[PDB]
Amino acid sequence: VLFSTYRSSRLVSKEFLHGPVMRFRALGEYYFQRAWNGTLNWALPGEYRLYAVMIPFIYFYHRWHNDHTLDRDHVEKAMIMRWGGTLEDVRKLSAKDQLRVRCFTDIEKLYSAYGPKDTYLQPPGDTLPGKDFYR
Amino acid sequence: MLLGGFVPRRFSQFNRDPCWMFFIFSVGFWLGEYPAMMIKYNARDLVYDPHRYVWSHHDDHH
Amino acid sequence: FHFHDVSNDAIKGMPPSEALHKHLENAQLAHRICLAKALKAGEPPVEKCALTWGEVLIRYQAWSEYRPPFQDSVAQAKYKKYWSKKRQEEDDKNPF
Amino acid sequence: TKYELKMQYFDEWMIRWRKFQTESDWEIEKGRQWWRRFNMAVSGALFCGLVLYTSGTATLKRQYGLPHFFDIGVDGQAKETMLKTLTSRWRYTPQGYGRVLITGVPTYILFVTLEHYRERRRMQQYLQQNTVFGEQMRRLLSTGKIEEYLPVNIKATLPASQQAIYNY
Amino acid sequence: MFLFFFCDLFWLRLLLCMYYCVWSRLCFIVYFNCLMLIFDFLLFCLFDLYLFVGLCLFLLLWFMLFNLYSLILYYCITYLNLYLLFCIVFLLYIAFLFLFCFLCDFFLFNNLLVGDSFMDVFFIRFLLCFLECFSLLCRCLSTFLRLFCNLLSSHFLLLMFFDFFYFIFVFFFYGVFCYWFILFIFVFCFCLLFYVFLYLLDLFAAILQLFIFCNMILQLIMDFLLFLLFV
Amino acid sequence: EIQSRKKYFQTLGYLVAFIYLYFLMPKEKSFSGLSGPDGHWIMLPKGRPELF
Amino acid sequence: MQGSWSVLKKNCSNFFPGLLAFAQQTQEAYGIWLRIYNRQQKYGPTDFVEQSETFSPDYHKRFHSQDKNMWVDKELCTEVSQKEVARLMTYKLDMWRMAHCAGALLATGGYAIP
Amino acid sequence: SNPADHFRPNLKALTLYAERQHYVDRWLHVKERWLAPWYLPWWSPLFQLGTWYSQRSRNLFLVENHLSYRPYKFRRNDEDRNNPY
Amino acid sequence: VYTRWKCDRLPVFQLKLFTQEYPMHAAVGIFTIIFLWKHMSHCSEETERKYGWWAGYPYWRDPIARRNETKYKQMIINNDVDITHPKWTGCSVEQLEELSRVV
Amino acid sequence: GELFVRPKLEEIPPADQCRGFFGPLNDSLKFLRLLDIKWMMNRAVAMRREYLIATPTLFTFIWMFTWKGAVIYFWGDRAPPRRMDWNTEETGRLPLGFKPTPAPL
């Protein structure tokens, strides 16, 4: 008596936002409602252009998220740990120095398991700072 | 299901459909980002971090 | 004052109740030391002694939960059943 | 009276402060467990009896008729005796919702009533205790709130090797 | 501890809303066998043997939206955890098993006692019954383990190969201008071939794994179905 | 008609959610502490002196 | 049908008269059912009275058999009239719905009021 | 290690912490508030559903007499095998 | 004509789907949810430090300690807890003052 | 697999034909039928009541796979230690001079 259990109890008029809804449906229907757009279990369409458009878009936004939100954490950790162990110590550097450090982190990523191991293993006799430099 | 749709015959025809225009733009990005990395990360003035031996991820995960 | 030894080597040959009580006593001692320093400095205790109080709280929670088993017919039966003479000899022989 | 609502806080506190559980309180809880098992047993017996009484005549004949699994002779005698006893008089043999109600409602009522009054009995037992748990129970029924850290406030007894904390 | 996170399907949910506001026919189903259990006519079942169709379809859609799109770089399989898959398979398998057990028909389990009366009951038949009852639970465990391990191994291999390709492409392409260019071109062509082969293999394996995942559940159901003949 | 309107609104909402999630929402528990929350406790007791 | 305020007012106004009428109908229907039940137990077939078991051929689950567990009393007109049988059927429907509502009330206590 | 780190959810937003004691007590208060009124008799199935299983489980915990030691569920450090405390 | 999927609203259809179509599956799922939140909903501080942080635990600021400090300060202030009580310190107030004067 | 039809009363062999672990438990040994598990298994197979062997097994497995397995894992009692921490039965009692609150009245 308070709320209807039937979908037929309308809350708005039939013509509410008809125009925008029709434009939205036109966008949806033009490429999808076609004979050659036969999907495999609703997930893989038959239209080639859907792949051609959606694979790049998905990759683009995922890559932006990864570069600006996920890998940034590792980059900042490397900067903090290698240059003082504190955020203020890193901020004491200039933007150019931070750029150099971040690009070295990128180098390490690109080698990963195949690059030279002198990027993280100090050869004997090397004059550069060691692990107990800031301790 | 890969049943049908516009299929450009060659490179020059990718501009005959907006979706394939976006696709070829994305392919340009994909393939052209590699030369940029070659130039940037094999640069003469690129210098390894002096403090690269102060800390490494190998320490942390071990 | 003196802190008890609650290291792994010391804890290995200790009953659970003794270890829990020692942890609680160490937490209380640390808390009172921090409170004494705060009083000497004159600053409020809540602004300096919150973490030590929380450590005392958690050690209290672990200490009050444990009730050593009562020695009765069924408990003694289980202990004697598991720890036979053969098992005792094997335990003595093992160097680990 | 609803004793469970009062007793849930007390039980949770006892679990949190089970270190101060005397052997008397442990015996009380063991008795509660034993009485729960007894209530389950008697309720199950009542349910089985109601099911057997309301069972159909053909069902009883099939159940308590030939063949005999063991065929010792006592088995057949017992089955025949029970079958004759059940099929001699007239029995109300409902089906469907009716059998559900007749078999279940008495069982549920019996089990619930026994358990509720045993909960009242346990509350009285803890009230009569001369331990810290009993004092907590009395304080709970008086003030209506569970006073945590009571054992260390009133300085409840501890082992001889753990009285240093009270040394103040 | 309460962690608040989101699945990686929001764009796909948007596409589903956009492209399925209007009806469309479906004619290709990864696991079609859930729809055709009976192949001989005049056979019918009093048990609800088509109850699995809806769950099968939804599971296929969900697992496809995750696994197939995970081939795109940086796409995340949000549910990829061993115990979470255990929970999923536990739900489905134990629910159907309890559906058969709630039937309160003990004769349904007569086939568990393997063999005939000639075989010794205690030393052969009973041990086979023990092994078969164990095998049901092992089938559940193997189903979820197979689904987890296939995805994990495939994506590990893809990540490692992609890292190697990035390394050689970025740090050794200069050999194209050098006298050892033929070696680099050979290696690059081999890497492209392996890239295409790996992607095709993963595409096929994902669909095959979903098919097997649904087939295990339907096999559980079919092991206890009894068909009457129309007369 | 009903489904068209519902899916239109759902599409708009999902679009806003997608933009926020992948372009505005920070990840929790950052190493530097410059973005995202580190977590905090909830359901703590209040006005219950007898509890301690 | 969907709920309405007019029907709510109608049923709230006639709630107690309806309950009283239902109780009177319950007494009458119990009398009618008692006559029918006595006649069934006395003159019914052995299978019908003993409630013979009919199991399904696939899962061996018992259910009512139309041939054995249903019996048409051809001589019921002597004891019970047609109108009484109609009254009993109508009361059975009303009693089933009332029984479910009463069960909900007993199960949920006072939370069944809304 | 690094490849293994790719297999993590990528949209973590917030983490909230709560002690078992606190929210268990709050849940008990809610249950008492809703099961207290007179119009819900103690013999009703709803009340028994709310109370009996919890009472039984707590009783089972109280009756427990184990010869081994069960470390505290909510220690600060439960990763060290040689330190149950 | 009447169909559940076409005529009923979404909450009603959800209840019908999980009560008269898949009730056992819903029951098993609820069972598993209860089990998970009863036995798999806790994480120690050491576990968080080992695995709880994307790039690793930032010891240089120790956010867990700050979180606990805020928690305990809030509890003390709201519940009016006297942290100088002998049960918390193990010694009388006068002994505490003596210790403060000593150190 | 195929439909199961219960045997008729005449198709069930006599109990004396069943064999136990060593041999038939005929007259003067009938009461040993209750104790011989193999004899009961053979009798159940003879009477086509094989479920008595199969139903308890499967259910047990389910009971272990569902409910007892986790209970033993999370709440079971591990093996006792060599040096045992028995309870001295000194804790809990109220101290001397304490005035307990009165019971309800």
Ligand SMILES: CCCCCCCCCCCCCCCCCC(=O)OC[C@H](COP(=O)([O-])OCC(O)COP(=O)([O-])OC[C@@H](COC(=O)CCCCCCCCCCCCCCCCC)OC(=O)CCCCCCCCCCCCCCCCC)OC(=O)CCCCCCCCCCCCCCCCC
């Ligand atoms: C229909 C469904 C079909 C589909 C199934 C689908 C699922 C698959 C199947 C398998 C199950 C999967 C698991 C899913 C999860 C379900 C939940 C779960 O597992 O919870 C377990 C969970 C385990 O407990 P827990 O939480 O781990 O805690 C452990 C503690 O032990 C807890 O302690 P507590 O305090 O709670 O007490 C528990 C107590 C439970 O027991 C009791 O409380 C006492 C007994 C209760 C009896 C109930 C009535 C039985 C019938 C009465 C008599 C009827 C006939 C009357 C007429 C007689 C005329 C002569 O048990 C004990 O502690 C053991 C005591 C044993 C004493 C033994 C003493 C020695 C002498 C007797 C034995 C030896 C006799 C030798 C004779 C030799 C002759 C030659 O709960 C329990 O098991 C206990 C609570 C529930 C008890 C219910 C009692 C009724 C059970 C049904 C009986 C009737 C049906 C069976 C027969 C059918 C025949 C056709």
Ligand SMILES: CCCCCCCCCCCCCCCCCC(=O)OC[C@H](COP(=O)([O-])OCC(O)COP(=O)([O-])OC[C@@H](COC(=O)CCCCCCCCCCCCCCCCC)OC(=O)CCCCCCCCCCCCCCCCC)OC(=O)CCCCCCCCCCCCCCCCC
């Ligand atoms: C908030 C409240 C919470 C409540 C909790 C309790 C559970 C829910 C309560 C009830 C809920 C409502 C609905 C229930 C189901 C309705 C079923 C139905 O529609 O039946 C219609 C049906 C009416 O149709 P009908 O045509 O008149 O007769 C049926 C046909 O014969 C049918 O013909 P057929 O061809 O189908 O014949 C087959 C039929 C034949 O059976 C029947 O139909 C006859 C009636 C049932 C007889 C059951 C007793 C069998 C003998 C037991 C012997 C036990 C000995 C143990 C000794 C131990 C010694 C130490 O079925 C069977 O063969 C099944 C036998 C049962 C197998 C049980 C297997 C259990 C395995 C256990 C696994 C392990 C468990 C965990 C571990 C435990 C141990 C550690 O109703 C009945 O026959 C009786 C229904 C009884 C309903 C239950 C009453 C509940 C009372 C509750 C009291 C306790 C409350 C506790 C509360 C706690 C605090 C909150």
Ligand SMILES: CCCCCCCCCCCCCCCCCC(=O)OC[C@H](COP(=O)([O-])OCC(O)COP(=O)([O-])OC[C@@H](COC(=O)CCCCCCCCCCCCCCCCC)OC(=O)CCCCCCCCCCCCCCCCC)OC(=O)CCCCCCCCCCCCCCCCC
């Ligand atoms: C203290 C800080 C704050 C946090 C407090 C939290 C308190 C927690 C209490 C303790 C809880 C313990 C247990 C937690 C377990 C968590 C487990 C978990 O997360 O599992 C993962 C799992 C992941 O699921 P999933 O696969 O991602 O799908 C769920 C999604 O929601 C998507 O699934 P779906 O798409 O299938 O969902 C259906 C969807 C269907 O699609 C849609 O409807 C499309 C829209 C989707 C919205 C939902 C997605 C959210 C996306 C991210 C956030 C969006 C931007 C937010 C911006 C925030 C800016 C600060 O429809 C809806 O979402 C319905 C709601 C629509 C709202 C529309 C509002 C329009 C307002 C317009 C106003 C206009 C005013 C004009 C004025 C003009 C004046 C002149 O999460 C869940 O399953 C849900 C967990 C929720 C558990 C309950 C938590 C308690 C409720 C908290 C509410 C807080 C409200 C206050 C916040 C205020 C701002 C700070």
Ligand SMILES: CCCCCCCCCCCCCCCCCC(=O)OC[C@H](COP(=O)([O-])OCC(O)COP(=O)([O-])OC[C@@H](COC(=O)CCCCCCCCCCCCCCCCC)OC(=O)CCCCCCCCCCCCCCCCC)OC(=O)CCCCCCCCCCCCCCCCC
């Ligand atoms: C205080 C504690 C409460 C406990 C908690 C209860 C929780 C709620 C559960 C439900 C309780 C019952 C609710 C009242 C029902 C009304 C009375 C009744 O039976 O109506 C007849 C009617 C019979 O149905 P049927 O399908 O025709 O029966 C087939 C038979 O063949 C029919 O046989 P027939 O074909 O030969 O014809 C006979 C017919 C011929 O009669 C007539 O034609 C005349 C009319 C007679 C019936 C009149 C009923 C009127 C109903 C409405 C009442 C007024 C409501 C007013 C509401 C507003 C108030 C302001 O007479 C009958 O209907 C007799 C049926 C058998 C008697 C059943 C009663 C047994 C329980 C009572 C005794 C308990 C003693 C405890 C001792 C303790 C010891 C320790 O009952 C129903 O409609 C069934 C109830 C429907 C709801 C079911 C809900 C699930 C039940 C699960 C129970 C499981 C066990 C309990 C534990 C639960 C834990 C989860």
Ligand SMILES: CCCCCCCCCCCCCCCCCC(=O)OC[C@H](COP(=O)([O-])OCC(O)COP(=O)([O-])OC[C@@H](COC(=O)CCCCCCCCCCCCCCCCC)OC(=O)CCCCCCCCCCCCCCCCC)OC(=O)CCCCCCCCCCCCCCCCC
């Ligand atoms: C005759 C009258 C004529 C009047 C003419 C008037 C003409 C002018 C227009 C009038 C004014 C506008 C009217 C409204 C239009 C709405 C939009 C529209 O047209 O939709 C199409 C359609 C139009 O109606 P219709 O097609 O004529 O008829 C509908 C059918 O009859 C039945 O529909 P159905 O059942 O098939 O489906 C309904 C619904 C399924 O049913 C429901 O969902 C209803 C139940 C939902 C409950 C959810 C909350 C549950 C919480 C837990 C329980 C709490 C218990 C608490 C208890 C007490 C505690 C003390 O379906 C859906 O969920 C799918 C559609 C969802 C729409 C998308 C929503 C997000 C859009 C976001 C856009 C903006 C993004 C951000 C932009 C930012 C820019 C910077 O409307 C709907 O489908 C209704 C959707 C309702 C969704 C409600 C969700 C609420 C979520 C927020 C809750 C906040 C709670 C806060 C609590 C705080 C506590 C501290």
Ligand SMILES: CCCCCCCCCCCCCCCCCC(=O)OC[C@H](COP(=O)([O-])OCC[N+](C)(C)C)OC(=O)CCCCCCCCCCCCCCCCC
């Ligand atoms: C039914 C079978 C379907 C088969 C579909 C086959 C598609 C064939 C695609 C050919 C190549 C496409 C290249 C795209 C390039 C995009 C831009 C870019 O830089 O990407 C590089 C990315 C990654 O390339 P990378 O790894 O070299 O990137 C280098 C970047 N750094 C150095 C920073 C690491 O390319 C891809 O990941 C493309 C893989 C595609 C695999 C096929 C996915 C199929 C499943 C999804 C289908 C989606 C359909 C949705 C339709 C709507 C549904 C409702």
Ligand SMILES: CCCCCCCCCCCCCCCCCC(=O)OC[C@H](COP(=O)([O-])OCC[N+](C)(C)C)OC(=O)CCCCCCCCCCCCCCCCC
């Ligand atoms: C780093 C370590 C990694 C370890 C990994 C280990 C594997 C983890 C796998 C997790 C994912 C997979 C989970 C699958 C599901 C497992 C289910 C399981 O075992 O849960 C059992 C557990 C057992 O519960 P429990 O643990 O609370 O048992 C209580 C027993 N005592 C009191 C003795 C301690 O089930 C639950 O957690 C749910 C319980 C509530 C729901 C059921 C209530 C009804 C119970 C009926 C019987 C008793 C009452 C009487 C009858 C009814 C009266 C009304």
